[PDB]
Structure formats: C-alpha cells, structure tokens
Design a protein that fits this description.
The protein contains one helix and 17 strands. The strands form five sheets. Strands 9-16-10-13-14-15-17 form a seven-stranded antiparallel beta sheet, with no helix packed on it. A four-stranded antiparallel beta sheet has the order 7-6-5-8, with no helix packed on it. Strands 1-2 form a two-stranded antiparallel sheet. The chain is globular. Helix content is 2%, strand content 24%. It has 274 residues and is mainly β. Strand 14 and strand 15 form a beta hairpin. The protein folds into three domains: 113 residues, Nucleic acid-binding proteins (OB fold (Dihydrolipoamide Acetyltransferase, E2P), Beta Barrel), CATH 2.40.50; 78 residues, no CATH class; 80 residues, Ribosomal protein L2, domain 3. It binds seven RNA strands through strand 12, strand 15 and helix 1. GO terms for molecular function: rRNA binding; structural constituent of ribosome; transferase activity. Keywords: Ribonucleoprotein, Ribosomal protein, RNA-binding, rRNA-binding. Part of the 50S ribosomal subunit. Forms a bridge to the 30S subunit in the 70S ribosome. Belongs to the universal ribosomal protein uL2 family.
Length: 274
RNA sequence: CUACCCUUGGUCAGGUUGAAGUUCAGGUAACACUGAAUGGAGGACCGAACCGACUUACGUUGAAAAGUGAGCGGAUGAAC
RNA sequence: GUAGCGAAAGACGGGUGAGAAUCCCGUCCACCGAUUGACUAAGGUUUCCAGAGGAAGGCUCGUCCGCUCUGGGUUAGUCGGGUCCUAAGCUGAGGCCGACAGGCGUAGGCGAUGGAUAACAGGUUGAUAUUCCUGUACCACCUAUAAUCGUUUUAAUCGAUGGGGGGACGCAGUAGGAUAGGCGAAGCGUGCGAUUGGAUUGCACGUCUAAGCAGUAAGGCUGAGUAUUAGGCAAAUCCGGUACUCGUUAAGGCUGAGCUGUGAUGGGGAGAAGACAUUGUGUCUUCGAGUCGUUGAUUUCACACUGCCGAGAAAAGCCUCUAGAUAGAAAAUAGGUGCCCGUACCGCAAACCGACACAGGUAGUCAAGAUGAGAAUUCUAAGGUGAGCGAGCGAACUCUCGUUAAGGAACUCGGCAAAAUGACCCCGUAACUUCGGGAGAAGGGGUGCUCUUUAGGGUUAACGCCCAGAAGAGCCGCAGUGAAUAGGCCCAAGCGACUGUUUAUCAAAAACACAGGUCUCUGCUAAACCGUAAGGUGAUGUAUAGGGGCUGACGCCUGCCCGG
RNA sequence: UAAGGUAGCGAAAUUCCUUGUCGGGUAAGUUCCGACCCGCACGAAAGGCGUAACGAUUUGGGCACUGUCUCAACGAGAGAC
RNA sequence: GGGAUACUACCCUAGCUGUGUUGGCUUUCUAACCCGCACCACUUAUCGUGGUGGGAGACAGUGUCAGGCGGGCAGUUUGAC
RNA sequence: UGCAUUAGCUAGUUGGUAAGGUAACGGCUUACCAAGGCAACGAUGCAUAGCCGACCUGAGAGGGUGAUCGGCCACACUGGA
RNA sequence: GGAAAACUUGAGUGCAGAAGAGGAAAGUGGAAUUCCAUGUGUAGCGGUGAAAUGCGCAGAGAUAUGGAGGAACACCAGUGGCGAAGGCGACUUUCUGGUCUGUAACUGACGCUGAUGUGCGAAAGCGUGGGGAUCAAACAGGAUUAGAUACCCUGGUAGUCCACGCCGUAAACGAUGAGUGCUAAGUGUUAGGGGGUUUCCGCCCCUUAGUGCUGCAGCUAACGCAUUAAGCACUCCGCCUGG
RNA sequence: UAGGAGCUAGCCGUCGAAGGUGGGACAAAUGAUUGGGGUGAAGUCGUAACAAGGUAGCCGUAUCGGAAGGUGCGGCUGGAU
C-alpha cells in the first residue's frame, strides 16, 4: 500500500512512500551485478548536454533478461527484489539446471510459480511468447520491436498494451499512451501487466529527497538575463512577451510538433496520440 | 583561485524532544478508549569542533589589495 | 629628526666581552594549556649540527643563525613508495570520421585518493634511527639434506588459457563483551618538616614488546550424510534445483573471534648512591628495591545484531574442484641470499601560500587533574614560551575597559550600542492549530554550611563510601549555580509556506530553489542537446518514462472573449 | 472587432488628488490597527483569498532594563619628554 | 427558335479489337542501397570484417540546383536640424 | 424554589485508631490504616428567597401575599480578634 | 408488602412439515447501448412538436456463422411471501436467520414498556479501486418561440453500477407507540393441520395463523374506523398544550 | 540580687482577615461600523403557489441562480390519465 507520514517536521507534512510489501528479499544476486558510474548529463566531450542530472545515491546495475531467450525450460520464481534503476521491481528466476536470471516482475506473480518461454508456452502471467501465438484481447508487456532484440515497449511500472487484431505479418497493438501500432508478429511479449502499480502516488515531500535521486534544481527562464534565455530580462516580473513560449535554445515550446517527416515507421502507425 | 560534476576517502563534544510501532492496565468492559512501560524517527530543537557572514565597534599612506573584537546563522544533512 | 617600529610580563644576580634592556647560566615570577603542546601529510629544499670573523642581512648587537670553512650530517628483506591490482579519467594497432592540422573509438595499456603484503624490546650521537648496535623474531628465494606419494594416467604434487566461491563494501540505533587509560586504599618503599599546632605523616610507588604454547568472552550457520544432471565454450572428484536420515539440538559439528595465563624475561629497567681511589664524584666495572589489592571504564569484537530507503565499486592476492601434464614430490633441517627510491630540518609555521621573521590560510592522528552533561567554563600537569630588537619617563584627545546620585528611551531615522535574561531542580502554562505543535509560552518558587535520620541512588556489605531519600533541627553573611560560562519576553500586522541558495570584495532579501499543480512535446537509432562529421548524453531508460514552459506547501477556489 | 471584470480583496510592497474620511491607541499619531469604497491605475496558475509552524526579513505598540539621553571620575594603550 | 450537326477537332452521352514502340499514375517485386538487427567465427575483442536468416527498399540517406521560413546567430544603421 | 443548555462529587474527605473539651459528642484538629464515602432518587454547583403561624380567594381537591399581626432565626459602616 | 406451593393457556425448551426477493460467498447462460474488424456499399445515417448541430465518402450505421467490453438479468411477477425498519427479484449451490401451522410433550409465568446504551439506517454529499457502456448534475451544440442554452434533442463531467469509509438525516406515514380481555357480518386469498364425496388432483366444507375487500353497535368536528378499530376496558413509555 | 520556674519584655516558626498584584474565568455596559429579523408604506419589478394556475405536488438530499426558482437521486399521495 502506501504509508502516510505523521507531520512531525515541516518537511514531512505531506509525504508518502511505498511500504515495499511486495519485496520479499532485500539483497541482490551477486553474479548479476555490474557497476554503473554516474555521467551526470555530460557526453564524451565532457560537456553538459542535458540539464538537471546530478548526483544521487550510488547504485549498481542489475542485468535484466529483456529478450526471453531460454526456451522450453521452465523456471521457478525465487524472489521479488527492489531495483534502483527502474520503477518496476524485479524477479529472480532460476531455471531447471541452475541458471539464474532477473526479469521484470509482473503484477500478480508469486514466489514459487513457474515461468517459461516459447511458442509452446501457454497464456498465463509472466510467460513470454511470439505475438503470433498470443490471442487477441489480452494485455501484454515487455514487447519487442525487432525479433530477438529484446523487449522495449511497456516496461515501466504499471504498464501494458493489448493485442487488437492481426494483419498479414503484423499485429495491431494499442500502446499505453493511447496510440495503436503495428508490430512484427515474430516479436515476443510477456503476458500481463508490469507490477508495482502505486509508484505514481508517492509524494516526494521534501526538496532533498529529490536530490537523493540525482535531480539538480531547475531555474525558470523568465528570471534569467537576456543573454541566457529568450524569456529573460524585464524590469519587474514580466509576461512572456513573445508570440510563443521558447526553449532556452530558442525554439517554440508549447505545441509545435517535433517528430520528423519521412520516418520509415510512419506507415506502421495507424492512429497516434501524444 | 573559483562554478558545476566524476571516482575514491574522511569528520561531526554534549544535551533535549520522543514518530511509526509494540506491549500491560487505571475508566475499564464485548480492551476500549487512554494511562504506564518499551522503542528510537526527524532536510527536529538548544549548543562546542567545523562551516558561514546578519549587526556593531575598530582598522582605512591598515598587522591584512577584505582582517580583528564582541555578539550572530547552520551544526545527521539539498552538511562539511 | 616627523609617522611608524606588527597583539602578549618580566625582575635581579652571575658570566663573557673592545663594548650588554639585547647573548649565556641561575633563581623567582608569569603566559598557553582540545593548546602558542606532541606526531603524520602536502609544500619548501640544506634552513639541520659544530667551530670561527660576520664589511652587508635582522624595524639592535654578535658578544646567533637562515654570510665562510668544512667538521660535516640522512644507513631499512619487515616503515612509506616501485619490481602487484584495478576506479574516474587519459591514451589506444587494426577501425570510423574529417580542407589540412586533426577528432572519435576496439581489444589492450597507463592510472590511488581504494584493495593486497613480513618487527618488536632495549642501548647509543653534536647531528639519523622500527634503518646503526644487542637480543628475540617473522617473510621470501636458492642450493645441499633425509623417511615418505610412487601405471605417473591417476596419485596429497603438478594444473589451466577452466570453473565455482571469496575478496566485496549504505545509514541510523542498541545491547553486551573485553581492553587502554584514569582511581581509592598500609602490600611496599622516603622522609619527619621550623612561623602555631598535628605526627595514621607528608607522600609516592607497584613495571616490560612483537613473535609462539595453551584456551576464549561472544558472533554467523535450511546446522552433518545418499542418487541424478537442459549447464559452468570441453575435465572436474567443485559450483545450483529437487527426492531423503538425526532435522528447527548447537550440543559443540564447522568457519571465523576480541582477549587472558605460561614461558619471551631469573633479561631489560626499576621509586634506588647502598659502589669509588674516578669518567669535573655529576658519572658508574661489582653488588639488590616491591611485582599487592580495589573501584569504575574510551578504542576493538563487528555495520555483529536490529531497523530503514535513497538500495549502498572493481580487479588481483586468496580458497576450492579438475582436465591435462609429468618422476615427484615436501618437508623439516643446515646453509646461503634479500635489489631500487625516500629518510637531515621546518611543518596548523621565522623554513609552506600570502612582496615581509605579515594578528590571515593550511588535510589527518594523540590529548592528563579539578569542575561539570560536556572536548563548555575557570584554574592547572606534562610540554612549550616570555614575542622575537625597540626601550625608559608621565596633559588635551582618540580607542578598549569598569563605576555612577535622581530620573528611565525624554536619545535617535530607528532602543543602534549597552544593560537586563541565562545553569540545575520543583510548580504552573493562553489564543490558535495542518493535532505535530505553539512551549523553555507567559508566570512562580528553590539552591551555602553543620548536626541528627527514618532512608534512599544505594558505595549497599549498611547506616559507614560519595551524592543524598529528602525530612527535621541549627549556624553565618549585604548577597549561597556567592567566580566564569549558560534564552530577554509579550501583543499586533506585511511578505515568503517550510530546511536550503545568492551578488569572492558596499545588497542575504519579499529575489532563486523546493515539495506539489498544470500545459505541451516525444513509440525508441525517441524528442531534446553537444559536434562539421563520426561519436555521444538522454539511458545500459521505454509514456506510472524522458525533455521543455509557466506556477509554487496546504485549504477554498480559478469567471468572460478564439475577432487579432 | 471578439468580449467589456464572476468570486474574493481593496487609500493595499498597488491611491494622483492625499497626511482621503470616521473610530482605536498617545497629553500630543503623516506611521500603525479596524472600518468605508469615490479600485487615477486590484483581480483569479507573469494565479486570487486565507493560513498553523518557520525567519540575523519588513513594520507598529508594551514590560524588563539601562550613561542612549537631561548632564563627571578611574585603569590600560597611542599621543607628550 | 435562347445556342446548332456540309468538310473538319470529332465527341460527354461512350462500349471499345489489337497495334512499332514513347511517356505519366498506383501497386507489387528484388539484385543497388540502408538497419544503435538477430545468430555464428576472426576473437584476444559486443569496435570492426565475413557468413546465414530477418526488416526495409528504389524510398530513405548523401551530392548539386531551386523556392520558402529563419534576432537562433552576425555585420551595420538609427537620416540630418 | 428552579436549572443535566449543572453528572461523576468529596480526599481530614470517607469509616475507624489515640490526645484534647465541650454543659457533652465526634474528622472538630492532630500521628495511623483501606480508598473509601457521596451520588441520575440529579450528590456537586449555579441562580433566587429569612421561615412558619397568619392573610387571601377558591365547591372541595387548595395553592398565591407577609405592609399587616404574632412566634422563631439573622444583622447593627465593613471585616477580623 | 414479605413468608411458604401448584396450574398452564402467556412465554420459552420439544416433535411433523410448508414457502420465499432474508443477509454474507461460488457457477451457468441469454439479450441489449459502446468499440475495433470482416462481408457489404455510397448517399446520406442519426436527431427533430419544427428543422438543424452532429455523425457521412476513411465506408459513418448496416448486416450474420461468428470477436470482445460495461452492467444488470423481462417470462414464473401477485390488495403474493419473507424482514423490526431502511428493505428484500434471472437463477444453481454454500452458511444460516426468521415466519407459520399441527401434536401440543415439558419449565412452572420465566412478561410488557422500554429512559441509558447499541444497531440498522433510503437517497444525495465527504473520498479509494474497478466507472464514464448506457444514464447524467455542471458544461456544450442546434433551432423553435415574440423571447435561449428554457418545453425538443443529443454529446458529455464527476456522480453513476459495485466493492472499500461513513455521515445519521425522508411524506422513513398504516400521517395510528408497545403487551392483554370483549362486541353484526359477508368476501376472496398465503402456509399448515381436518375431512365428505371423489377428481382423473377436482367439488364442498371445519380450523389455525394471516393476506384483502365490502360492510352493525360504538366513535369523532366530520371524514372515515368497525377483528389487519380511531369501539368497549387494563399496564407502561414518550409527547403536547396560540402563531 | 530578683539568678533560676514562670510572668512583662525578647526572639523563633504554624495558621490568618484584608491587602497587593498576578493570570485568567464569569457577568454586565459601551463601541466607528455591520447583518439577519419585525412593522409600515407595500414606492417598485416579476408572477412563482391556489384552476392538471399555462411546464402536478411533498419530504430527505445535492447543486446552480441575487431571489423566485433550476436540476438530480431515493421515498410518500396529501394528484390528473
């Protein structure tokens, strides 16, 4: 659920967090860990390219099995663990000979239950299949985009798409943003919704808790100077005195579409939103 | 030097309050409220080291091309 | 012959000299004492130590060093670095890109601020010392020495270019266990005071290492055995899932573990002169001086345990198990052997950064007694220093400091500055609230010393040993936290919710951030951004996500106009 | 042309006229607080109105308390020989 | 009559037989070309190269030319009395 | 007399244990013991008022006045000794 | 009033059965508005008191073996039954409540009111997750009408539906508090017991408890009540006395 | 002597009325201004309800509208077809 905090400080006045009651083992698997040094928005020339990325806690990368490869060998779910690198939790699965992997934990998934992959597999939560063998109307997550590449769509907390119909070698799928799309029928997907659904409701509460996640502050354009931002300058406070609002790099920012013409996936997108 | 950041290290006298939680019992009986023990949370409180720089006095061919004295803010954190 | 001579306590006697407020010795006095003390970094580079003249140097003299001469002076198998390991980064054959110059990047290299690695006690110089000397150890390598394993496949050994494990990691908090250090006392030693008394009396004291033998105080442990095998680019006899026997005992089976007793050491050293004809009686060749017993206890066990969310490096050294390979070893002794670089000195400063022997700045470690909660405060031990050239006399005015009759903000732009408050204990405490608070609200009272005592914390053995359980009875003063240190409070409005940030050097704020809102863009080689491009950030993310704009906790809300 | 300001506030960090008018506080109040509305020229996310707690913020009044003031001596340092 | 069919476009109302061959339109194919595309070897190595399967496909990308937009950035001027 | 738009009242209080001391009694006070005793039958508290005889009118069921006129209580500027 | 006993009507504990929409849990299937797709096709489809907004060239709807969703489940449906009341409805089952009759076995009145207290508590509202399929405040559009966006219409927001917290309110009214005796009838109907003929499951009739409809005496101001009293008596609580 | 014992006197601590504030509590009065109600005049506008009063009521509730009223959901007849 979500725990509310008692207002003992002004910083805890309206703060909530998760109770982490789905987490069943609070210590990661040693052989599936890699380093993840921060690169706080600075590219290979060392300059800042995206603003507001900073320094939070040290975390480590857990390697996730986004292509469900091991096929026709079932696996037991060992634990549901926490991951600082995403908003879902992860599940440790152990295959029938002893190989351990991590996967994204779906919504109702229990320690002990069985999970498998392939065309031979059956439709229950956490099995991975090609989109061809998945009946129309079910909810799926972790959807590949090119066959064998690994899942790319609907991996965040509480995310799913549903199968809508079948073309020749495409299926129709309705994404979480409300757009519908064609995907190659040999791309895989796993059955069910991604878990940890109450992630959207936690109130962060105090400025410094944002800093624990590596968010640096953001200063608005209209209180900078005219060489810094198009909204800058003006004697007192001032309106945005332009026909449109602007980026700091001077492009119109409030309604101008930015998708490029002539992408090859323009004929795959039947109906789009956002 | 200074502004951000990255990796890897270090430091923070002492007091005070007493969160979530647990547990027994005055009123107690459809325990149940509220009294007591426990528990130790917090960009909590007071305050040294440390970090700052609000008032003031003194300095102004200064001891000093930004300091000293007395007070003062922060002091487990968005700390140094 | 003006300003200044850079914070701080000195006085006298002796000495030395051509000449002394200055140099040296003495005695007394004083200052710092969580440091003006003691170590280690960085940095500096001969300033270090002896002699002798200083022509300059020093906000004097030389009759010192920071000029001269050498006389010089730095010693490591174990300390700190390299012959080890990797992080961030920096480079990078082939490769990609680019008018050129060049940019990027693969394996790989390099790279500590981290990981790994073997020594302590005493003696000794003008100048070095875990380095020299003496003792006792430890770690490696090489060669001889012997019993042992003896298809060399296997076999304890070899042993991967192989595997599994480990190394290997946050923050808070608690309860313990040990130990360092401090503490009182007759175990034992020295001395017996001149000014009145007392003589249980003034004190002091109790030792000592790394290594190696024994056990150990607590900690983790689905805790000990059988078969199979999509795998560990193949071998494993080792790593995982299950099916079972004592099962959840922790016996003690295991790993790891602070520490304690013996020997190390009847040696060193010892509060000791009791040892000199001497080394100027200081000094020592000889010869001993106790190793008691309480009291209460930081650092270590160990991020052990418990809790929490923000979810807390890597690689080698190392431990296993093997193919494979050979004879085949190793081990325990005796011998040899153990390279290079640093090492003097200053070092929270007269030696560094600051033009200076500058009231500044400068990472880490250690830190005794009283008082106290305390590393606060005041005094002090140890140890350092008397301030560093300036010194001797005695108005206005300026600056620091203390006091003030009567009055008490009348001052002034403004109670600016000062005064007042303050510790501990006990009683009490409003409006308003987001139910947390407000709150240490306000406001009251108490505090020394002696004796009873009934009795607490008990020092409990118990009144005795200190604070008291705190109650009675007294005594003194103007005053009892008798010094020093230690919140002034209330009522009412603006703004900003809050902690935070800001104009190094005239502005700390009502400005910026913020947690929340909302709008908008973006389906992944995402948008956005950097770049000529390659590359790259976003992101090893995937619409509960990411970028941009505006607003700014919370509560009640957010009306009209789409003509431009 | 498209519409002509709903709520709530209002001599405000916004009011020219202006020290606006009335009441409170003082012996005396241009500030302050409460009230009025004639809003030069407030107004709903360049947000409106309110608000406990918080502030080296701004502003007004009270108690303590005092050489701040009505309105002198002493100590050290500079100065003076 | 309010236009009009002799020759001739020649016809919407056309339906159409096939014709040397030429040039639009839309699909569909693969060899160009392209996948921060998958598996497999060099490999030591996921960069890169080659093989095989998949996607896409004469598009995209890039070159030359044209046209629009372009305080994002630049050089200037802001007459002169 | 009335109010629950007064419900929880008391702590020498509540009983007893010993000294008083009163013309006598004891919680009346003082040392002791248990929290008891008092309560919705409204203790507690508030507000109001000297009481009764008596008056007076009511068929009786009765209840309203007190200058009257008698009986009792309390008072003598206020508050104590 | 206290003291000693009994009886059972009244009540409870028995026994034989009837019924169900009585509360909390699991299944089976139908039909529909909404969507996406096939076929299909092209000019209108929807909506209108009057037309229009809209939805239409994408095939909008359409159309069926067949694809789905939201939510309930006409028929058995009733002056039927159950629940104190708010109420209760496709059902199959689970756990039950409770009603009632009959035999009346037993305890020997074991009762009623009912201040306190505890519950339920309809709808809307404060909020969560399925909710926005349909409906629908608020909002929107089109015109009518002399007047608009009103009567007309849809789209559509929470609210809806349900589960998860309640608030404590209705014409929660039978505008009749609850328990017991007695006084004209007829008339259906719900359950159990009683039968006469029988019926091929039906006619007539006793009774109980009720469900209803007409209707004396009594009643009130009259309405109207009269065995499912506002009549004639007893007990308790509560309430009232001009607006 | 007047020393003891006592006494006047002397001190020394228990309880005191009043006081002094001190905080409040409670009560009353007043307060620039204000906002609900009553009476009058109904000055004014509209016609909601009574006639199926032109588009039946009523309760609980909820929302909008200055108000009247508007709507919506459960329940009631104290209503026409």
């Amino acid at each position: 659920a979500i725990k509310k905090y008692k207002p003992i400080t002004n910083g805890r006045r309206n703060m909530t967090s998760l109770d982490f009651a789905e987490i069943t083992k609070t210590t990661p698997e040693k052989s599936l860990l890699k380093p993840l040094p921060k690169k706080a928005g600075r590219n290979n020339q060392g300059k800042l390219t995206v603003r507001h990325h900073g320094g939070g806690h040290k975390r480590q990368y857990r390697v996730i099995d986004f292509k469900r490869n091991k096929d026709g060998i079932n696996a037991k779910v060992d634990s549901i663990q926490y991951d600082p690198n995403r908003s879902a939790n992860i599940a440790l699965v152990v295959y029938a000979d002893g190989e351990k992997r991590y996967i994204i934990a779906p919504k109702g998934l229990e320690v002990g239950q069985i999970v498998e992959s392939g065309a031979e597999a059956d439709i229950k939560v956490g099995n991975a299949l090609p989109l061809q063998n998945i009946p129309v109307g079910t909810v799926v997550h972790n959807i590949e985009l090119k066959p064998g590449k690994g899942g790319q769509i609907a991996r965040s907390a509480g995310a799913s798409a549903q199968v809508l119909g079948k073309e020749g070698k495409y299926v129709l799928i309705r994404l979480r943003s409300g757009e519908v799309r064609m995907i190659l029928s040999t791309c895989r997907a796993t059955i069910g919704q991604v878990g940890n659904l109450q992630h959207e409701l936690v109130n962060v509460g105090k400025a410094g808790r944002s800093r624990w996640k590596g968010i640096r502050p953001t200063v608005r354009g209209s209180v900078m100077n005219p060489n810094d931002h198009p909204h800058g300058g003006g004697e007192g406070r001032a309106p945005i005195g332009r026909p449109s609002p602007m980026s700091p790099w001077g492009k119109p920012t409030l309604g101008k579409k930015t998708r490029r013409g002539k992408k090859s996936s323009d004929k795959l997108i039947v109906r789009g939103r956002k």
